[PDB]
Design a protein around this ligand. Structure first.
Ligand code: BCL
Ligand code: BCL
Ligand code: BCL
Ligand code: BPH
Ligand code: BPH
Ligand code: U10
Ligand code: SPN
Ligand code: NKP
Ligand code: NKP
Ligand code: OLC
Ligand code: LDA
Ligand code: LDA
Ligand code: MYS
Ligand code: MYS
Ligand code: MYS
Ligand code: FE
Lengths: 302, 281, 239
């Protein structure tokens, strides 16, 4: 057996890496956590430091409030009996207000009120986390590609829980907070709209989801195959092409007739993943607002 | 034509079969013995699909659909127009996919690189074979396989899934989906991270790998590292396809009920199945 | 022609523009295409070359502008073996010494890669303030065995990527007392030895040497890793 570079053979450790400083406010960095030998077989062993500023604290607090709001509901649905809690944990569900309430915020607590409180907490948690991904990159002088990619995921979540219900006329169209119930919601969504397989934006979304697994399999395997020439040091291969970048390009050129560069493959990658939730959000947005039956809609076109 | 750095790599050697007989390029494409094999299986499979289009009586690609044999044919051969073309096309596709993998091995050898890429591609071939070979044989009929048509094969997914209730409740399906979602999340983050270092703010020098590690520690308290992320992308995508094949090989072979039943074991344990209220009492 | 129709049509036009941008971004190295004699090919394809972009390299190392006029900057000891294109080019010497085929190296800069602070990224442990082995088999002092099953030498140090806390090269002392670097990814650290499948014992001395005992430049890494990987093809009469 030749070494495959899937797991590290020999771990080394030095003083803890405190990281680049740039324009980061060092007051808000934690100390260093423990080194993990276990993780060190697959990647880096160091844990921490983490950065915890105002937006991070706002996000963690909000997110826990969202979590606690759902859990308190689950305890109440379990008659406060811990055994029913664990037994039916996957079955409990914090559902939205009934359609009678329209877009009102005056549903009683047990009849959709708590869902609206939970969703608010989730709204604050996600958007303040997004602000964090922007500012953490700005403080280090980096491009904003991570915040822009996160926006694509946020888009689908916003359409599911906020934009589409608003255009439909009722919070009852939103997604419940529950393991099994949100699955049942997804299934009923497709049934109600005439089979989501025939929503071409759903088709596009699937092609990119599959395409993302295809591309990361290709790119992860390619980089491991040229790690024997330092291939994973992708930034310096961008600044000064080495035999790793040439052989990686030539494998794919000889195999399928064209190739990428060490920088350009990361543009293929970011766009392949981002298009999943981009196309998906559009397809959900048009369902019930413009198109009631995708199969029938599909029939009268291609 | 050659890339500007390509000539020095175009040496003889590395083939598995045929010596220097097929050791050459057509344009950018390397040939090799398994390039010839790939052409053979693909061309013939394309001819058959053309034949099946004539028998079907349509030239539009959205209507062409090559069906497998009726369930009554069991695991036996079928006449061409009654499930036989599907059988021969499946033979040619399998040959093409496997030939492609062995051509990649030869290219790996001429370039002196690891074999990770054909090894990863083999997982996709195994998923395909799970649906058209392993599962149908285990259930006893070629007609449990999917049809070769753009829209008919979507209908097959829906037919098969709803046969078992809401397929969402298949627990190996849950794990597969989790890997697919986590993969696209990791891919978006990795592409973004590298581009954000090579293309930093206006007025700045290129960032270093230490900035990438620092960004992710600041963000979530851990950086997997430049090698680990490519290990991780490989792991996530292959695990997604492994559990996909697993979730299908067990459906109709060791499980026949509505998948939501599987969890009702957790619900009807004798030490809490009878407690009133809640959801399951 | 409803709104959903307009949207799906619009998306496909956006997708085609995206594909055209992505493909041109991926032609910043290695293009224009050349003929096998090195003159530019007549058929360059339907995508044009992108307009140049510039990278400002850290630590005062200059700028990079791509695409730009390309050059191998090294002799290539190969000869054309056919009038028609599409056939292999054959080595005119020793392909492992001449660095062609799977033994190829690229003329990268003869400078070490630096970390975020401007210090050498890769260092021998004995110069690496505070570094040490933490898990797995410590190979220092182990003997190094080639694919001929003879011993070539023994491990006298580990070269570590400081910022990423990773072992990248083994430093191996040969019978004459000189040393060579061996890429971590091409060795198997076993309980009683380091085994190297790519090279026979008598090919270790031909691993290219580095000019300083405490740093390795990008050019040196490419020559070293190219040489070692070329042994998979060219040391095969000894495997
Ligand atoms: C994986 C689990 C299911 C399944 C469930 C679904 C669902 C659900 C959907 C699809 C969709 C598609 N599936 Mg399917 N599909 C399966 C098996 C297959 C196989 C196969 C040989 O195993 C193939 C070739 C396809 C092919 C396709 C495409 C037509 C389409 C987008 C895929 C994509 O971009 O992926 C990622 C790959 C890439 C980006 C790279 C390019 C791949 C190219 C485009 C594939 C083209 C094949 C060509 C049409 C047929 C051969 C032509 C030759 C000339 C003979 N499916 C099995 C049965 N598939 C979607 C759709 O819209 O269908 C109409 C969709 O919504
Ligand atoms: C019976 C069920 C229906 C169906 C109903 C639906 C519905 C309904 C939807 C999908 C959607 C999707 N479907 Mg479908 N689907 C069916 C059949 C399939 C088949 C198949 C084999 O046939 C496949 C492969 C797919 C595949 C897919 C995906 C391409 C797509 C979701 C993208 C994604 O990444 O979402 C995952 C990503 C997100 C939800 C974004 C999340 C972002 C937020 C910001 C994250 C917050 C995290 C939170 C704070 C918690 C943090 C915790 C801390 C980490 C501790 N479907 C059938 C026809 N499908 C979606 C879509 O886009 O449709 C067009 C969708 O809404
Ligand atoms: C639609 C009704 C059911 C359902 C029923 C099923 C059924 C039934 C199945 C799945 C399967 C899958 N489902 Mg489900 N599923 C549903 C809802 C979902 C949802 C969701 C959000 O609701 C999601 C995300 C998923 C997700 C998934 C994946 C785990 C998996 C498909 C990928 C796969 O196996 O690829 C594997 C990859 C391949 C098969 C591709 C192989 C390609 C080959 C090797 C080469 C092709 C080459 C090409 C022809 C060459 C062309 C020429 C070039 C273009 C130049 N399902 C609902 C509840 N689901 C499938 C599965 O697990 O399969 C194992 C499956 O059969
Ligand atoms: C391109 C599309 C894909 C995508 C992209 C994407 N997601 C992203 C980003 C990007 C580019 C980010 O930058 C961002 C991120 O920070 O990544 C690390 C994010 C992210 N995507 C996430 C999740 C996520 N993304 C998903 C999907 C996808 N994301 C798409 C597939 C999914 C699903 C359903 O598939 C999920 C669940 C997060 C990891 C992160 C957003 C973080 C965030 O918004 O947090 C707000 C909430 C909190 C801060 C608090 C949550 C609290 C917990 C719910 C409970 C705690 C329990 C208990 C008290 C503690 C446990 C303790 C024990 C461990 C000791
Ligand atoms: C395991 C992780 C993912 C993966 C990985 C992966 N795929 C790969 C590789 C890797 C590592 C390659 O190296 C290889 C490649 O070369 O990529 C460019 C490949 C590849 N994955 C491809 C497609 C593909 N991969 C997919 C999936 C995945 N690939 C996984 C999710 C999917 C889907 C549906 O999810 C598709 C469509 C190809 C682009 C390529 C393999 C090319 C190949 O084999 O070429 C030889 C064959 C031909 C030229 C044609 C043969 C034609 C048949 C004889 C007739 C048609 C038969 C077919 C059954 C009809 C189907 C009709 C549909 C409507 C159902
Ligand atoms: C870091 O690194 C990285 C890179 O790089 C730096 C990369 O690039 C890549 C690669 C990734 C990308 C480029 C990104 C884009 C890729 C995707 C989005 C994934 C999706 C991919 C596709 C959809 C493309 C798929 C296309 C395929 C599968 C190839 C198409 C195939 C053909 C057109 C057919 C040709 C191929 C065949 C059949 C093989 C055999 C070759 C032949 C020509 C057939 C044989 C012909 C003959 C027999 C002729 C014989 C002639 C004779 C005998 C006469 C000779 C003459 C005499 C005089 C004697 C990655 C991952 C990477 O991480
Ligand atoms: C011991 O247990 C305790 C009590 C400690 C617990 O806390 C137990 C905790 C649990 C058991 C956790 C249970 C949690 C879950 C099961 C989570 C499941 C969640 C999902 C499956 C999410 C599915 C989708 C969610 C969506 C789509 C949300 C959308 C949100 C909206 C976009 C936000 C809308 C905001 C509104 C309406 C407020 C308006 C705001 C303005 C500014 C006007
Ligand atoms: C009406 C329907 C349209 C969609 C609605 C809005 C959805 C939100 C989605 C946002 C766009 C998707 C992400 C863009 C691609 C990923 C990022 C990218 O590659 O470009 C960013 C790049 O420049 C770097 O940013 P800078 O450092 O600031 O230049
Ligand atoms: C021949 C094909 C013609 C197709 C028809 C015409 C075009 C169709 C419509 C739309 C095409 C949209 C292409 C968008 C390309 C992405 C542009 C982009 O991303 O710009 C920002 C980018 O610099 C940031 O650079 P970095 O910060 O360095 O990453
Ligand atoms: C205080 C300690 C708290 C620790 C809590 C840790 C939770 C996150 C763990 C794994 C997420 C990994 C996601 C992988 C995506 C990384 C994308 C990438 O490219 O990273 C490369 C590397 O990090 C630089 O190059
Ligand atoms: C960024 C790479 C682009 C990948 C292109 C993917 C093409 C998939 C086409 C699927 C077609 C879906 N639909 C319903 C419109 O036919
Ligand atoms: C769905 C992703 C596939 C998109 C296909 C892009 C085709 C690129 C072909 C570029 C031609 C390369 N060449 C020969 C000019 O060097
Ligand atoms: C579903 C569409 C798939 C498109 C596959 C494109 C193949 C392109 C091969 C490029 C070869 C160009 C060589 C010209 C010298
Ligand atoms: C008398 C023989 C009748 C059975 C023929 C079955 C052909 C279809 C099976 C597909 C096999 C795909 C894998 C081939 C290696
Ligand atoms: C089902 C067809 C299999 C085709 C052969 C796949 C090639 C496998 C590569 C062999 C080497 C793997 C070593 C990497 C771990
Ligand atoms: Fe990468």
């Amino acid at each position: 057996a030749e070494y495959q570079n899937i797991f590290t053979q020999v771990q080394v450790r030095g003083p803890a890496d405190l990281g680049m400083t740039e324009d980061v406010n060092l007051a808000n960095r934690s100390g260093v956590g423990p080194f993990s030998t276990l993780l060190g077989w697959f990647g880096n062993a160091q844990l921490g430091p983490i950065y915890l500023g105002s937006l991070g604290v706002l996000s963690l607090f909000s997110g826990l409030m969202w979590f606690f709001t759902i859990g308190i509901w689950f305890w109440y649905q379990a008659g406060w009996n811990p055994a029913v809690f664990l037994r039916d944990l996957f079955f409990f569900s914090l559902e939205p207000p009934a359609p009678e309430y329209g877009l009102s915020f005056a549903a009683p607590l047990k009849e959709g009120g708590l869902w609206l409180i939970a969703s608010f907490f989730m709204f604050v948690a996600v958007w303040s986390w997004w602000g964090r991904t922007y500012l953490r990159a700005q403080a280090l002088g980096m491009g904003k590609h991570t915040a822009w990619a996160f926006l694509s995921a946020i888009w689908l979540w916003m359409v599911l829980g906020f934009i589409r219900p608003i255009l439909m006329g009722s919070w009852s169209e939103a997604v419940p907070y529950g393991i099994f119930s949100h699955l049942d919601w997804t299934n009923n969504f497709s049934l109600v709209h005439g089979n989501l397989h025939y929503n071409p934006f759903h088709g596009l979304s699937i092609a990119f989801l599959y395409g993302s697994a295809l591309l990361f399999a290709m790119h992860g395997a390619t980089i491991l195959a040229v790690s024997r020439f330092g291939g994973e040091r992708e930034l310096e291969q961008i600044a000064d092409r080495g035999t790793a970048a040439e052989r990686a390009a030539l494998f794919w050129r000889w195999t399928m007739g064209f190739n990428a560069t060490m920088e350009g493959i990361h543009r293929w990658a970011i766009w392949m993943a981002v298009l999943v939730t981009l196309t998906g959000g559009i397809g959900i947005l048009l369902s019930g607002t413009v198109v009631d039956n995708w199969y029938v809609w599909g029939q009268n076109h291609g | 034509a050659l890339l500007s750095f390509e000539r020095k790599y175009r040496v003889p050697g590395g083939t598995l079969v045929g010596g220097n007989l097929f050791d050459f390029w057509v344009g950018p494409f390397y040939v090799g013995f398994f390039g010839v094999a790939t052409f053979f299986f693909a061309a013939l499979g394309i001819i058959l699909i053309a034949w099946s289009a004539v028998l079907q009586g349509t030239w539009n690609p959205q209507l062409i659909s090559v069906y497998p044999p009726a369930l009554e044919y069991g695991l036996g051969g079928a006449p061409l127009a009654k499930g036989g073309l599907w059988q021969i096309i499946t033979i040619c596709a399998t040959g093409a996919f496997v030939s492609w993998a062995l051509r990649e091995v030869e290219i790996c050898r001429k370039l002196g690189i690891g074999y990770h890429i054909p090894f990863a591609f083999a997982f996709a071939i195994l998923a395909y074979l799970t649906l058209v070979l392993f599962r149908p044989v285990m259930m006893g009929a070629w007609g449990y396989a999917f049809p070769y048509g753009i829209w008919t094969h979507l209908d097959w997914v829906s037919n098969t899934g709803y046969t078992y209730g809401n397929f969402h409740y298949n627990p190996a399906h849950m794990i597969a989906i989790t890997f697919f979602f986590t993969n696209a999340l990791a891919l978006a983050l990795h592409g973004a991270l590298v581009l954000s270092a090579a293309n930093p703010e206006k007025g700045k020098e290129m960032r270093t790998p230490d900035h990438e590690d620092t960004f992710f520690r600041d963000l979530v308290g851990y950086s997997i590292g430049t090698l680990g992320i490519h290990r991780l992308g490989l792991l996530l995508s292959l695990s997604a396809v492994f559990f996909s094949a697993l979730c299908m090989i067990i459906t109709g072979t060791i499980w026949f009920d509505q998948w939501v039943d599987w969890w009702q074991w957790w619900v009807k344990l004798p030490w809490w199945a009878n407690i009133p209220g809640g959801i399951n009492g | 022609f409803d709104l959903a129709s307009l949207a799906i049509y619009s998306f496909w036009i956006f997708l085609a523009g995206l594909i055209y941008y992505l493909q041109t971004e991926n032609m910043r190295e290695g293009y224009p295409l050349e003929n096998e004699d090195g003159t530019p090919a007549a058929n360059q394809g339907p995508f044009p070359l992108p307009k140049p972009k510039t990278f400002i390299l850290p630590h005062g190392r200059g700028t990079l502008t791509v695409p730009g006029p390309e050059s191998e900057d090294r002799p290539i000891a190969l000869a054309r073996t056919a009038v028609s294109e599409g056939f292999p080019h054959a080595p005119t010497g020793d392909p492992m010494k001449d660095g062609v085929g799977p033994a190829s190296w690229v003329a990268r800069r003869d400078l070490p890669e630096l970390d975020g602070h401007g210090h050498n990224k890769i260092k021998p442990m004995k110069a690496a303030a505070g570094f040490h082995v933490s898990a797995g088999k410590n190979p220092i002092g182990l003997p190094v065995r080639g694919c001929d099953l003879e011993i070539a030498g023994k491990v006298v140090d580990i070269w570590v990527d400081i910022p990423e806390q990773m072992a990248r090269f083994l430093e191996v002392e040969l019978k004459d007392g000189s040393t060579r670097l061996l890429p971590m990814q091409m060795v198997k650290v076993q309980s009683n030895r380091v085994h190297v499948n790519a090279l026979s014992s008598d090919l270790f001395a031909g691993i290219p040497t580095i000019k300083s005992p405490t740093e390795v430049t990008l050019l040196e890494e490419d020559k070293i890793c190219g040489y070692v990987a070329g042994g998979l093809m060219y040391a095969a009469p000894k495997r």
